[PDB]
Paper text:
SAA1.1 is an acute phase protein that becomes strongly upregulated during inflammation. Chronic inflammatory conditions, such as tuberculosis, leprosy and rheumatoid arthritis, are risk factors for the development of systemic AA amyloidosis. We report three cryo-EM structures of SAA1.1-derived amyloid fibrils: one that was extracted from the diseased murine tissue and two that were formed from murine SAA1.1 protein in vitro. In vitro and ex vivo fibrils possess parallel cross-β sheets but differ in their overall topologies and fibril protein folds.
Cryo-EM reconstructions achieved spatial resolutions of 2.73 Å for morphology i and 2.95 Å for morphology ii. Morphology ii is also polar but presents C2 symmetry. Both fibril morphologies contain an identical protein fold. Lys24 (stack a) in one PF is packed against Glu25 (stack a) in the other PF. Glu8 (stack b) in one PF is opposite to Lys29 (stack a) in the other PF. In conclusion, both in vitro formed fibril morphologies contain the same fibril protein fold and differ in the PF number.
Numbering used by the authors:
A (entry chain G), B (entry chain C), C (entry chain K), D (entry chain O), E (entry chain S), F (entry chain W), ...: 1 to 37
Write the structure that this text describes.
């Protein structure tokens, strides 16, 4: 694919552009995410 | 595919452009997400 | 694929451009993520 | 793939451009991530 | 792959461009990461 | 692969360009990472 | 999507299940094809 | 979508289940085809 | 996606399940093909 | 994706499951193909 | 992805499961192919 | 990814599971191929 | 075309006879402007 | 075209006769401007 | 084209007759400007 | 083209007749500018 | 093209008739500029 | 092209008629500039 | 400007994509052009 | 400018992509052009 | 400028991509061009 | 400038990519060009 | 400038990539060019 | 400048990559060029 971004990308808490691929018999767990201002 | 973005992208809490692909016998769990201002 | 970014990329807490690939019988756990201002 | 970045990339706490690949019978655990200002 | 970066890359606490590859019967644990200002 | 970087790369605490490869029956543990200003 | 083929595929001169994808500024040619019996 | 084919496919000169997808500024040619018996 | 083929594939002159993907400024040619019996 | 082939693949002159991927400023040629019986 | 082949692959003149990947400013040629019986 | 082959591979003249990868300013040639029986 | 200006041009904060032309996939920003006397 | 200017051009903070032309995949920024007397 | 300027150009803080031309995959920044009298 | 300037050019802080041309994968920065009298 | 300048050019802090041309994978910076009288 | 300058060029701190040309994988920096009278 | 052409361009006798630019006190003469079939 | 061509360009007799630029007190003469078939 | 060509360029008699530039008090003469088939 | 060509370039009689530059009080003469088939 | 060519370049009679530069009081003469087949 | 060529370059009769530079009061004459097949 093709991806183009021009400007600002803001993320307080989390993941950006994560790529999990080609897994067999795989397991995982992600936790919570908080944003306070 | 083709993706073009011009400007600002704001995310308080979460994931952006996540790609999970090509999985067999796979399991996972994502937690909650809070936004306070 | 093709990836192009021009500008600013801000992440308070988390992962950016993570790539997990080609796993068999794999397991892991990610923790929480907090953002305070 | 092809990756091009022009500008600023800020991460308070976390990982950037992590690549885990070609694992068999593998396990790990990542901790939490805090951001205070 | 091809990787090009032009500008500034700031990480308070964490890992950048980590590459774990070609593991069999492998285990590890990463700790937490704090960012205070 | 090909890697090109032009500019500044700042890391307060952590690892940069770590490469762990070709391991069998291997184990390790990484500690926490703090950033104070 | 889902694709199931059960039987026989016969081709004297040609290509089969050709997939060209995700191209930008591309150009090509394919010549003539002759079947004589 | 869903595609099921059960039987026989015979082609003297040509292409089969060709898929061209996700093109930008592209151009090509395919010559003549002759079937003689 | 999912692809299942059960049977026989016969090709006198040609290519099979060719995949060209993720190209930028590319160009090529393929000559003629002759089948004589 | 997922690909399953069960049976026979016969090719007098050609290529099989060719994969060209992730090219930038590329160019090539493939000559003619002759099948005589 | 996942690829399974069970059976027979016969090729008089050609290449098999060729993979060309991650090229920049590249160029090549492949000659003719003849099958006579 | 995952690749499984179970059976027979026959090639009179050619290459098998050739992998060319991670090239910059490259160029080559491959001559003709003849199969006579 | 033809453009004639005879006199005085006064600008406290801003741009003058700015010409942006012939752009494709472009993006920019201009901040605030303050005039105090 | 034809452009004639006869007189005075005064600018406290800004740019003059700026020409940006013939751009593809471009992005930039210009900050604030302050005029105090 | 034709450009004629006859007189005075005064600029406290800024750029003059700046020409940016013929750019592909480009990105830049210009800071603030202050005029105090 | 044709450019004629007859008179005076005064600039406290900035650049003059800057020409950036024929760039591919480029990136830069210019700081702030201060004029005090 | 043709460029004629007749008069005076005054610059407290900056660059003059700077020409950057024919760059590929380039990156630079220019600091702040101060004019005090 | 043709360039004619007749008069006076005054620069407190900076560069004059700088020409950077024909660069590939290049990077540099220029510090601040101060003018005090 | 931007120019894109995809297909065939045939000219028996003449010029294609001629560019004469930035001339002062210039003279020339072009001859006739014949096309016979 | 930007120029892209994909396909065939045939010229029997003449010039293609000629560029005459930045001339002062210049003269020349081009002859005739014939095309016979 | 930017120039990209993908395909075939045929010229029987003439010049291709000629560049005459930056001449003062210059003269020349080009002859005729014939094409016979 | 930037020039990219991928394919075949045929010229029976003439010049290709000629560059005459930076001449003062210069003269020359080019002869005819014939193409017979 | 930048020049890239990938493929075949055929010239029966003539010059390719000629560069005449930085001449004062210079003269020369080129002869005819014939192509017969 | 930068020059890259990948493939075949054929010239029957003539000069390739000729560079005449930095001449004062210079004269010469080149003869004809014939190509017969």
């Amino acid at each position: 694919g093709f991806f183009s971004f021009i400007g600002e990308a803001f993320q307080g808490a989390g993941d950006m552009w994560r790529a999990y691929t080609d897994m067999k018999e795989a397991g995982w767990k992600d936790g919570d995410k908080y944003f306070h201002a």
